[PDB]
């Protein structure tokens, strides 16, 4: 509170810039209720808690955010800004994390000389760069004989895929495969990406690219693993969203000769593609993209006939969703005779109409074995389940075949896996989709917490300093995935045909409200709940959660398909048919974590600095949002609680001699620093002395920087005076 003197600068809120710099006119007296500030207009700030202090300029623009002494949100924002805009630097460290800000401009920082520059160097001796992270993983692979994961997260288009592209480029260079993987992209995007209300090309799954190496750590080939596919999107879309791209690519290619058998209407004509009312994306030509997708299958060894099989199966799915059920009241339904969408479905899928029709409208019930008729509602649920099952299995089939062009016969000695994964997703209206994504983030974040904690332990021990803080997100994870947690209660409710979104909501309240502090209820709603995730609170609307979680595939419907004459279709299928989307999500996520936990992880966070693909353009609102969702702000709050500033005794001397008398300068410079510092900073809990470094709590280095500033300012007024005396006396003699 002695930091808030005259001319001291602080950050205050601003509706447009988020944080605004301000300079103190009058010193703050303990008791004052207003600060006298100066914007570059003067203000009267409404205070008991003071505004954020600006970092001294020697710390500004540093390579590692954790070097800021005032370690807070505006510091983070400002530092990335000046590095990005003033210095055109897109890469900045945040401890072990690499932060990458999308410049929307092709930079010449990825060439061979730069790769050679990064090769053989240590983490931190070079400027932040995707190549350094790559070099670390490569180095540690050989060194520790451990497999590595490079986790590259963020919202689609913010730069994940570019980062992955250059990690691979780097591996290929310091050690074909990078070419093939790049070539598969339009395939994966077409079956795995969709337009959402906030992103035109969003990945709705995590892509894990295993780069394999022999005993000599040379790339032999790759293996693509996929997790967390968003099944609900196959048969449902919110307003302004689309199903997966490839459906639109097909519906926009309806008139092409080779696709006439598919009998595709336009996107607005299929139940499975129209619900969002947005069959097109500005700037996207789905017809063109179809060509690119077909080309990519060709490049990856998928035969022209197999490609047609893919398209038969997708059109099948489209027509399947248009099959209309007729209620023969009220535990009973039928399909109209010679029903067009069913006829087309069965033709494209090589199965018999009546056999398919029967098992779309009946259930085989096996102490006795009956063939039960089913209601329209049960029939639509089963049909939708089947659609989702067909799609997922197709998705896998495609990935497997991409992997055929990527595997090598060579024995694999080790791998580095690059994970392309979404981060935290919060819209104005959050549903089951967002709930699963943020669940996944809670698990990845946990691996990250534990990893940083471990490395901190080692670093403390290496410097002979005792311990330290661990911020555990197991409670959040448990609220989501344990018995009587969100997912478990959701499954429970779905096996009750009287269950609804509202009855489910109520049981969430009875179980968790005022029982778990991470769970909350909006005051004016009984149709929503609020989860305190890692980075932010998120409110979910319960609506649709039961419908999207259900996923019961009727065995007899599958059996029909398995007997198809269309010989690709059975290749897809070579409880569990009553598992649930949420539960399958849990399973997939746990599989992913099994892979990840069996490796040393490395972290890249990719962010969008603006919403319009503006070259080097930094929008504060967007950036704060992006930093928060990628976890940086919370991680940094955690860092800011310990001993984030870390200086060598050498560096402490070099910077702060000017604060020293000659009476306390010794030969044991390290001991000088200890005694000098115990004088300047009386509270001994503000720092810890280590083998080679001093660890400072937040603010401490900034305070030392103010003392240094003070001294040099006085030294200057003093010099100016002793030349005023000298020149006055010489005037008068």
């Amino acid at each position: 509170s002695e930091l808030y003197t005259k001319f001291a600068r602080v950050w205050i809120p601003d509706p447009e810039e988020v944080w605004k710099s301000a300079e103190l006119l009058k010193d703050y007296k303990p008791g004052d209720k207003v600060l006298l500030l100066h914007l570059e207009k003067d203000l009267e700030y409404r205070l008991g808690e003071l505004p954020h202090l600006r970092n001294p300029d020697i710390l500004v623009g540093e390579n590692d955010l954790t070097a800021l002494s005032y370690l807070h949100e505006p510091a983070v924002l400002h530092n990335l800004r000046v590095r990005f805009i003033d210095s055109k630097l897109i890469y900045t460290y945040c401890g072990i994390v690499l932060v990458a800000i999308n410049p929307y401009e092709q930079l010449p920082i990825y060439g061979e000389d730069i790769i050679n520059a990064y090769s053989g160097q240590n983490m931190g001796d070079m400027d932040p760069h995707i190549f350094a992270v790559a070099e670390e993983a490569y180095k540690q692979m050989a060194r520790d004989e451990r497999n590595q994961s490079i986790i590259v997260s963020g919202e689609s288009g913010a730069g994940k895929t570019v980062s992955a592209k250059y990690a691979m480029r780097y591996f290929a260079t310091v050690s074909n495969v990078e070419e093939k993987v790049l070539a598969s992209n339009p395939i994966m995007e077409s079956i795995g990406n969709a337009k959402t209300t906030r992103n035109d090309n969003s990945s709705r799954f995590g892509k894990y690219i295993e780069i394999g190496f022999d005993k000599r750590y040379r790339i032999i080939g790759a293996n693509m693993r996929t997790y967390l596919l968003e099944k609900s999107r196959v048969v449902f879309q919110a307003e302004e969203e689309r199903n997966y791209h490839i459906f639109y690519q097909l519906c926009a290619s309806a008139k092409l000769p080779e696709f006439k058998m598919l009998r595709l209407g336009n996107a607005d004509s299929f139940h499975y593609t129209k619900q969002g009312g947005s069959p097109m994306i500005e700037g996207v030509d789905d017809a063109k993209e179809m060509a690119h997708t077909r080309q990519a299958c060709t490049l990856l060894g998928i035969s022209e006939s197999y490609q047609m099989g893919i398209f038969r199966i997708l059109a099948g799915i489209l027509h399947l969703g248009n099959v209309g059920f007729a209620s023969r009241d009220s535990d009973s339904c039928t399909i109209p005779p010679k029903h067009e969408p069913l006829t087309i479905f069965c033709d494209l899928m090589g199965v018999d109409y009546e056999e398919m029709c029967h098992w779309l409208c009946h259930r085989k019930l096996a102490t006795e074995t009956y063939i039960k008729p089913i209601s329209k509602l049960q029939a639509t649920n089963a049909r939708d389940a089947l659609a989702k099952h067909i799609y997922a299995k197709l998705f896998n089939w495609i990935v497997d075949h991409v992997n055929q062009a990527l595997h090598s016969a060579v024995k694999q000695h080790s791998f580095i896996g690059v994970l392309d994964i979404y981060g935290f997703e919060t819209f104005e209206i959050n549903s089951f989709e967002q709930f699963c994504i943020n669940y996944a983030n809670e698990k990845l974040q946990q691996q990250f917490n534990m990893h940083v904690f471990k490395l901190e332990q080692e670093e403390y021990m290496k410097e002979q300093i005792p311990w330290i803080d661990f911020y555990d997100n197991q409670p959040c994870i448990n609220l989501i995935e344990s018995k009587l947690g969100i997912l478990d209660l959701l499954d429970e409710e779905c096996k009750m045909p009287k269950g609804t979104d509202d009855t489910w909501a109520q049981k969430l309240y009875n179980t968790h409200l005022n029982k778990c502090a991470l769970f909350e209820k909006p005051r004016m709603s009984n149709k929503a709940f609020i989860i305190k995730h890692f980075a932010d609170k998120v409110e979910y609307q319960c609506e649709g959660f039961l419908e999207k979680n259900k996923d019961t595939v009727f065995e007899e419907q599958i059996k029909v398909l398995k007997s198809s004459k269309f010989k690709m279709l059975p290749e897809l299928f070579q409880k569990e048919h009553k598992k649930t989307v949420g539960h399958q999500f849990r399973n997939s996520l746990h599989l992913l974590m099994e892979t990840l936990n069996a490796t040393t992880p490395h972290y890249v966070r990719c962010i969008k600095p603006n919403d319009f693909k503006f070259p080097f353009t930094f929008d504060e609102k967007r950036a704060v949002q992006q930093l928060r969702a990628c976890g940086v702000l919370e991680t940094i709050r955690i860092s800011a609680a310990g001993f984030p500033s870390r200086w060598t005794y050498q560096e402490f001397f070099s910077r702060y001699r000017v604060l020293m008398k000659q009476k306390d300068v010794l030969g044991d410079r390290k001991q000088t620093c200890k005694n000098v510092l115990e004088k300047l900073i009386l509270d001994k809990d503000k720092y810890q002395f280590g083998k080679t470094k001093i660890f400072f709590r937040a603010g401490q280095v900034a305070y030392l920087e103010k003392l240094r500033a003070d001294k040099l300012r006085a030294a200057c007024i003093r010099i100016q005076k002793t030349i005023r005396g000298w020149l006055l006396r010489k005037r008068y003699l």
Partner: protein, 133 residues
């Protein structure tokens, strides 16, 4: 005003602030400026402006007596010991050291930095004048 200036000047001489400048205080100031006057010389000087013949000079005796560009130029030529029209940090560290004041090299470099308006790492005349003002 100008009056308070004269007072500040008076006070430079009047070390003990006793209200009068003795011959000893004069020789002190003089010796400082590289001068070396005999007591005799100091007395005649103090007598020259000692109106009340009391042997010492007070402010109103002083104020009565006293009642720049060149001065700064002369000052500049003292710092700039290698007459190249630029004052280096070295030249300024030489003079300040001479002047009595003990600064670190960082303190010196800062003063140069602040006075170096055209950011060229050394102080020219107009920069020197501007800093003195």
């Amino acid at each position: 005003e100008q009056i308070a200036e004269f007072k500040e000047a008076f006070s430079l001489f009047d070390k003990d602030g006793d209200g009068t400048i003795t011959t000893k205080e004069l020789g002190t100031v003089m010796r400082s400026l590289g001068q070396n006057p005999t007591e005799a010389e100091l007395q005649d000087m103090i007598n020259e402006v000692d109106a009340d013949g009391n042997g010492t000079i007070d402010f109103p005796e002083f104020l009565t007596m006293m009642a720049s560009e060149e001065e700064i130029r002369e000052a500049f030529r003292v710092f700039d010991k290698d007459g190249n029209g630029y004052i280096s940090a070295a030249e300024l560290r030489h003079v300040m050291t001479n002047l009595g004041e003990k600064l670190t090299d960082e303190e010196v470099d800062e003063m140069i930095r602040e006075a170096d308006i055209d950011g060229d790492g050394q102080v020219n005349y107009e920069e020197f004048v501007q800093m003195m003002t």
